[PDB]
Amino acid sequence: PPYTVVYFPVRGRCAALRMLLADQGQSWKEEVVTVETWQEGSLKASCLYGQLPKFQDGDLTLYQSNTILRHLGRTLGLYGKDQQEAALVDMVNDGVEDLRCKYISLIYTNYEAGKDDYVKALPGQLKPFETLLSQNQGGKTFIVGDQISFADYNLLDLLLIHEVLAPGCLDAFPLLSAYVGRLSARPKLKAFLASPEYVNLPINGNGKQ
Amino acid sequence: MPPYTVVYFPVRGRCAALRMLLADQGQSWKEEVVTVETWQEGSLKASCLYGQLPKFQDGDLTLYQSNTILRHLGRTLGLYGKDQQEAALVDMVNDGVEDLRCKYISLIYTNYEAGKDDYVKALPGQLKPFETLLSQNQGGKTFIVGDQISFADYNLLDLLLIHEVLAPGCLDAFPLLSAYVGRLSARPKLKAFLASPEYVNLPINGNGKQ
Lengths: 209, 210
Ligand SMILES: N[C@@H](CCC(=O)N[C@@H](CSSC[C@H](NC(=O)CC[C@H](N)C(=O)O)C(=O)NCC(=O)O)C(=O)NCC(=O)O)C(=O)O
Ligand SMILES: N[C@@H](CCC(=O)N[C@@H](CSSC[C@H](NC(=O)CC[C@H](N)C(=O)O)C(=O)NCC(=O)O)C(=O)NCC(=O)O)C(=O)O
Ligand SMILES: [Ca+2]
Ligand SMILES: [Ca+2]
Ligand SMILES: [Ca+2]
Ligand SMILES: [Ca+2]
Ligand SMILES: [Ca+2]
What we know:
The structure is a homodimer.
Chain A: E1 3-7, H1 15-23, E2 28-32, H2 35-40, H3 42-46, E3 54-57, E4 60-63, H4 65-76, H5 83-109, H6 111-134, H7 150-165, H8 174-184, H9 187-194, H10 196-199
Parallel strand pairs in A: 1-2
Antiparallel strand pairs in A: 1-3, 3-4
Helix pairs in contact in A: 1-4, 1-7, 1-9, 5-6, 5-7
Bound molecules: oxidized glutathione disulfide (2 copies) and calcium ion (5 copies).
One oxidized glutathione disulfide binds next to helix 4 and helix 5 of chain B.
């Protein structure tokens, strides 16, 4: 396969790029890194920023989950139709990463005491994505433009993991709700999301969700 | 009138790198300044996509997210690598810059007193990947990716400048980063901008800490 994904046995920051690859019919190899192997230190020391994911595209080695998403976006034509739409794609993805950031901070550093405040704040954090859908073909296509982009895969994962954290959190948002259903029904993606490759990995590395 | 408008607090902050980019590229822009009082009134904030600044206008294109603005100017002004592989390396650098900027912002705004010594102790391990990247590209003598400037250079340069204010001499451990700061800061239009009142008379951050 042209691609290799190197990561812990978790969905985490590789979930969206895996959905992208599956949906696009691309083949890849998973190199699973155990925490025992990670704690040994040598792989970590070799990583540019001492972190995973690490990704290989033939001779090219990449780090940074959003670098991997933008690279796949660029090379597979999942980055909008022109420079103006590419900027809108980036603006969506940077917004997804900000909330993913907040989610990861809750999960790994403050889950027991901070979940109440997080869930209370969540509608205000999701509403921008509903507003963006409402301004693009009535929400009937994708988050930017009329073709899928890497930002759609990242937003879709963000929405899925938030439905597990806070069940019902999309019920006030009809366009986000319909978008989750529509993209989740794309045949290759539907098959991936139902497969044990996806279903039998935990969302996060500490067993919280 | 200029095609660009930057809408921000009277701070360098997350606009410093994109302003350096615009000035070094000889582009004109308008600064729209937002006071704390205006921000607190709430109307502008409610109208912002994610409730935050910067906001950037390029004609009728309205953008938010500082790295979105950097990438957009990187596309439209040809500062995004020579091909697809280089563009990915440019992203990889910028995402690393943003991760450390993140940590810097968290120190400055939420934990300066108690956290500064720990931060400064961790800092060489956080700067070293950028020294390593320079060492692997033409011996560190040109740019952070490839042989032409990219938006990631302006963001990294800003990152390095504010860390020298936070931890003077921190680049003494990193000869290629140190020479790089000096070199890029000497580019004539950028040198002029960095010396000018419109840069020097803004604070680095919004809370008076640096
Ligand atoms: N920007 C990079 C981030 C990559 C990243 O964070 N990788 C993590 C896994 S997902 S991140 C999962 C978890 N993150 C956190 O615990 C961060 C929570 C809080 N907000 C904080 O800033 O400390 C974590 O593993 N943090 C790492 C740590 O602090 O030790 C990793 O490799 N960790 C191994 C390591 O660093 O040794 C990307 O997008 O890929
Ligand atoms: N991802 C966006 C970030 C934009 C952003 O953070 N904008 C800030 C100014 S620079 S950021 C400076 C400062 N950060 C902090 O106070 C805390 C940083 C820590 N990591 C945390 O998240 O808790 C801050 O203003 N945090 C926002 C806040 O809590 O009000 C803003 O508009 N704030 C006004 C607002 O939100 O109302 C981008 O890249 O442009
Ligand atoms: Ca394998
Ligand atoms: Ca396409
Ligand atoms: Ca339902
Ligand atoms: Ca324009
Ligand atoms: Ca160029």
